[PDB]
mmCIF file of C-alpha atoms in Angstrom:
data_model
loop_
_atom_site.group_PDB
_atom_site.id
_atom_site.type_symbol
_atom_site.label_atom_id
_atom_site.label_comp_id
_atom_site.label_asym_id
_atom_site.label_seq_id
_atom_site.Cartn_x
_atom_site.Cartn_y
_atom_site.Cartn_z
ATOM 1 C CA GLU A 1 -2.494 6.389 -31.939
ATOM 2 C CA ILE A 2 0.132 5.624 -29.467
ATOM 3 C CA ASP A 3 2.753 3.179 -29.882
ATOM 4 C CA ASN A 4 2.655 0.966 -26.577
ATOM 5 C CA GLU A 5 5.738 -0.800 -27.256
ATOM 6 C CA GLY A 6 8.136 -2.001 -24.630
ATOM 7 C CA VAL A 7 5.459 -0.916 -22.081
ATOM 8 C CA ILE A 8 4.994 -3.717 -19.247
ATOM 9 C CA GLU A 9 2.772 -4.273 -16.179
ATOM 10 C CA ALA A 10 3.345 -2.371 -13.002
ATOM 11 C CA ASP A 11 4.743 -4.276 -10.290
ATOM 12 C CA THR A 12 2.500 -4.765 -7.287
ATOM 13 C CA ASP A 13 4.773 -5.478 -4.291
ATOM 14 C CA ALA A 14 5.231 -4.409 -0.851
ATOM 15 C CA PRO A 15 7.912 -1.441 -0.672
ATOM 16 C CA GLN A 16 11.370 -3.014 -0.546
ATOM 17 C CA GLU A 17 13.236 -2.116 2.832
ATOM 18 C CA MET A 18 14.537 1.117 2.858
ATOM 19 C CA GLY A 19 17.116 2.497 5.537
ATOM 20 C CA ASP A 20 16.595 4.396 8.680
ATOM 21 C CA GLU A 21 16.982 7.909 6.767
ATOM 22 C CA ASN A 22 17.616 9.426 10.259
ATOM 23 C CA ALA A 23 19.823 6.972 12.119
ATOM 24 C CA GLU A 24 23.384 7.138 13.270
ATOM 25 C CA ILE A 25 25.778 5.820 10.724
ATOM 26 C CA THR A 26 29.179 5.010 12.326
ATOM 27 C CA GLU A 27 32.573 4.383 10.785
ATOM 28 C CA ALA A 28 32.183 0.509 11.347
ATOM 29 C CA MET A 29 28.744 0.780 9.870
ATOM 30 C CA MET A 30 30.200 3.051 6.861
ATOM 31 C CA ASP A 31 32.994 0.274 6.174
ATOM 32 C CA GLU A 32 30.691 -2.588 6.556
ATOM 33 C CA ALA A 33 28.236 -1.077 3.990
ATOM 34 C CA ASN A 34 31.276 -0.447 1.309
ATOM 35 C CA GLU A 35 32.338 -4.007 1.316
ATOM 36 C CA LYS A 36 28.711 -4.860 0.790
ATOM 37 C CA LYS A 37 28.586 -2.243 -2.018
ATOM 38 C CA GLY A 38 31.672 -4.141 -3.716
ATOM 39 C CA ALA A 39 29.938 -7.470 -3.582
ATOM 40 C CA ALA A 40 26.687 -6.320 -4.851
ATOM 41 C CA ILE A 41 28.403 -5.267 -7.967
ATOM 42 C CA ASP A 42 30.445 -8.408 -8.092
ATOM 43 C CA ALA A 43 27.085 -9.936 -8.235
ATOM 44 C CA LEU A 44 25.876 -7.660 -11.001
ATOM 45 C CA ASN A 45 28.682 -8.041 -13.380
ATOM 46 C CA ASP A 46 28.355 -11.730 -13.116
ATOM 47 C CA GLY A 47 24.646 -11.482 -13.614
ATOM 48 C CA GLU A 48 23.037 -12.425 -10.262
ATOM 49 C CA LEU A 49 20.595 -9.465 -10.011
ATOM 50 C CA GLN A 50 18.610 -10.683 -6.991
ATOM 51 C CA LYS A 51 21.598 -11.216 -5.003
ATOM 52 C CA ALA A 52 22.618 -7.631 -5.990
ATOM 53 C CA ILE A 53 19.381 -6.503 -4.910
ATOM 54 C CA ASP A 54 20.035 -7.905 -1.284
ATOM 55 C CA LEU A 55 23.589 -6.780 -0.861
ATOM 56 C CA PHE A 56 22.393 -3.510 -2.153
ATOM 57 C CA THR A 57 19.725 -3.356 0.660
ATOM 58 C CA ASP A 58 21.917 -4.860 3.238
ATOM 59 C CA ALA A 59 24.206 -1.674 2.182
ATOM 60 C CA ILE A 60 21.365 0.494 2.350
ATOM 61 C CA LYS A 61 20.541 -0.387 6.109
ATOM 62 C CA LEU A 62 23.922 0.331 7.278
ATOM 63 C CA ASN A 63 24.622 3.444 5.403
ATOM 64 C CA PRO A 64 21.016 4.768 4.408
ATOM 65 C CA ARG A 65 22.376 8.144 3.752
ATOM 66 C CA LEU A 66 24.413 7.313 0.575
ATOM 67 C CA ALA A 67 22.584 8.291 -3.024
ATOM 68 C CA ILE A 68 24.661 5.731 -4.785
ATOM 69 C CA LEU A 69 23.271 2.658 -3.005
ATOM 70 C CA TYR A 70 19.820 3.882 -4.183
ATOM 71 C CA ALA A 71 20.671 4.594 -7.828
ATOM 72 C CA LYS A 72 22.791 1.088 -8.306
ATOM 73 C CA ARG A 73 19.645 -0.756 -6.690
ATOM 74 C CA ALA A 74 17.353 1.098 -9.018
ATOM 75 C CA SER A 75 19.678 0.113 -11.676
ATOM 76 C CA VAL A 76 19.141 -3.866 -10.936
ATOM 77 C CA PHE A 77 15.253 -3.099 -10.134
ATOM 78 C CA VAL A 78 14.642 -1.903 -14.025
ATOM 79 C CA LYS A 79 16.233 -4.931 -15.286
ATOM 80 C CA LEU A 80 13.716 -7.046 -13.182
ATOM 81 C CA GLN A 81 11.133 -5.042 -14.812
ATOM 82 C CA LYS A 82 10.123 -3.408 -11.553
ATOM 83 C CA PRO A 83 9.727 0.433 -12.206
ATOM 84 C CA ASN A 84 7.785 1.424 -9.267
ATOM 85 C CA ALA A 85 10.338 -0.089 -6.840
ATOM 86 C CA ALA A 86 13.105 1.811 -9.301
ATOM 87 C CA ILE A 87 11.246 4.770 -8.787
ATOM 88 C CA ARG A 88 10.954 4.351 -4.869
ATOM 89 C CA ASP A 89 14.903 4.050 -4.792
ATOM 90 C CA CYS A 90 15.737 6.966 -7.235
ATOM 91 C CA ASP A 91 13.014 9.315 -5.387
ATOM 92 C CA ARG A 92 15.342 8.583 -2.415
ATOM 93 C CA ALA A 93 18.695 9.252 -4.022
ATOM 94 C CA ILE A 94 17.541 12.559 -5.482
ATOM 95 C CA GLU A 95 16.052 13.616 -2.003
ATOM 96 C CA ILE A 96 19.782 13.153 -0.804
ATOM 97 C CA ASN A 97 21.872 14.333 -3.966
ATOM 98 C CA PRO A 98 20.082 15.846 -6.997
ATOM 99 C CA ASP A 99 23.235 16.931 -8.299
ATOM 100 C CA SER A 100 23.805 13.025 -9.107
ATOM 101 C CA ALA A 101 22.642 11.928 -12.694
ATOM 102 C CA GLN A 102 22.275 8.289 -12.523
ATOM 103 C CA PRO A 103 18.938 8.640 -10.364
ATOM 104 C CA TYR A 104 17.249 10.402 -13.615
ATOM 105 C CA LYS A 105 18.950 8.254 -15.692
ATOM 106 C CA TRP A 106 17.091 5.197 -14.487
ATOM 107 C CA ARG A 107 13.959 6.571 -13.056
ATOM 108 C CA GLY A 108 13.442 7.893 -16.823
ATOM 109 C CA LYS A 109 13.656 4.142 -17.726
ATOM 110 C CA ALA A 110 11.422 3.253 -14.930
ATOM 111 C CA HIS A 111 8.676 6.049 -16.417
ATOM 112 C CA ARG A 112 9.595 4.698 -20.024
ATOM 113 C CA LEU A 113 8.517 1.062 -18.733
ATOM 114 C CA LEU A 114 5.276 2.096 -17.424
ATOM 115 C CA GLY A 115 4.579 4.267 -20.340
ATOM 116 C CA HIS A 116 4.622 7.604 -18.598
ATOM 117 C CA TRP A 117 6.089 9.304 -21.926
ATOM 118 C CA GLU A 118 6.099 12.572 -20.524
ATOM 119 C CA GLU A 119 7.587 11.901 -17.047
ATOM 120 C CA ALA A 120 10.273 9.754 -18.810
ATOM 121 C CA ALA A 121 11.404 12.670 -21.206
ATOM 122 C CA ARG A 122 12.203 14.916 -18.554
ATOM 123 C CA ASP A 123 14.370 12.745 -16.428
ATOM 124 C CA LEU A 124 16.146 11.316 -19.174
ATOM 125 C CA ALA A 125 16.662 14.885 -20.613
ATOM 126 C CA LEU A 126 17.713 16.046 -17.342
ATOM 127 C CA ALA A 127 20.201 12.986 -16.853
ATOM 128 C CA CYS A 128 21.656 13.748 -20.323
ATOM 129 C CA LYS A 129 22.462 17.303 -19.200
ATOM 130 C CA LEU A 130 23.671 16.312 -15.661
ATOM 131 C CA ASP A 131 26.203 13.521 -16.779
ATOM 132 C CA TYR A 132 25.719 12.576 -20.800
ATOM 133 C CA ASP A 133 25.417 8.895 -21.875
ATOM 134 C CA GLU A 134 24.557 7.338 -25.148
ATOM 135 C CA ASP A 135 22.052 5.040 -23.292
ATOM 136 C CA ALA A 136 20.239 7.881 -21.685
ATOM 137 C CA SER A 137 20.203 9.849 -25.248
ATOM 138 C CA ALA A 138 19.089 6.784 -27.255
ATOM 139 C CA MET A 139 16.316 6.511 -24.792
ATOM 140 C CA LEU A 140 15.175 10.206 -24.639
ATOM 141 C CA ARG A 141 15.121 10.125 -28.610
ATOM 142 C CA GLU A 142 12.983 7.240 -28.388
ATOM 143 C CA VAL A 143 10.529 8.746 -25.941
ATOM 144 C CA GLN A 144 10.795 12.351 -27.307
ATOM 145 C CA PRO A 145 7.946 12.222 -29.843
ATOM 146 C CA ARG A 146 5.784 10.027 -27.683
ATOM 147 C CA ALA A 147 5.868 12.647 -24.921
ATOM 148 C CA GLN A 148 5.541 15.394 -27.394
ATOM 149 C CA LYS A 149 2.407 13.607 -28.991
ATOM 150 C CA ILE A 150 0.833 12.812 -25.566
ATOM 151 C CA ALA A 151 1.304 16.718 -24.136
ATOM 152 C CA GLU A 152 -0.168 17.956 -27.587
ATOM 153 C CA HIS A 153 -3.041 15.770 -27.028
ATOM 154 C CA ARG A 154 -3.266 16.702 -23.605
ATOM 155 C CA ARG A 155 -3.555 20.374 -24.230
ATOM 156 C CA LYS A 156 -6.621 20.438 -26.706
ATOM 157 C CA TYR A 157 -8.242 18.187 -24.323
ATOM 158 C CA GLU A 158 -7.756 20.217 -21.252
ATOM 159 C CA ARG A 159 -8.490 23.410 -23.271
ATOM 160 C CA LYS A 160 -12.029 22.146 -23.972
ATOM 161 C CA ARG A 161 -12.471 20.561 -20.636
#
């Protein structure tokens, strides 16, 4: 008996626009993506989450090798209850800088939204050791016994199987 509270329906959209991972990023471009970054936060404080996503995407296309632009867009994406698109962003952030804690914080929420108990118990616990937050901790403590219970069930099964 597993408590599926807070668990929603997986987003079934086309991949959001990523960058050109292998593109030349110039001084101008680098400036031009920074101003967009600032504006996309201005929208995020103010609550216009979709204007944030467009302004993060507009930055990502000019500076596709900046891990924060992917950590922060997936910050928004979780709010719009879009975990796969979050995960998509997060996976791109780590692949750049795995030393950054945010990509594991959000990707762990994304997994929590989808009901991936274990997947979530890792990433959160990992972000808690990379850069502790009370928001990550509280989430982890919530997921823990779920992810435990599921993993304990997974054994007893795969053992017979």
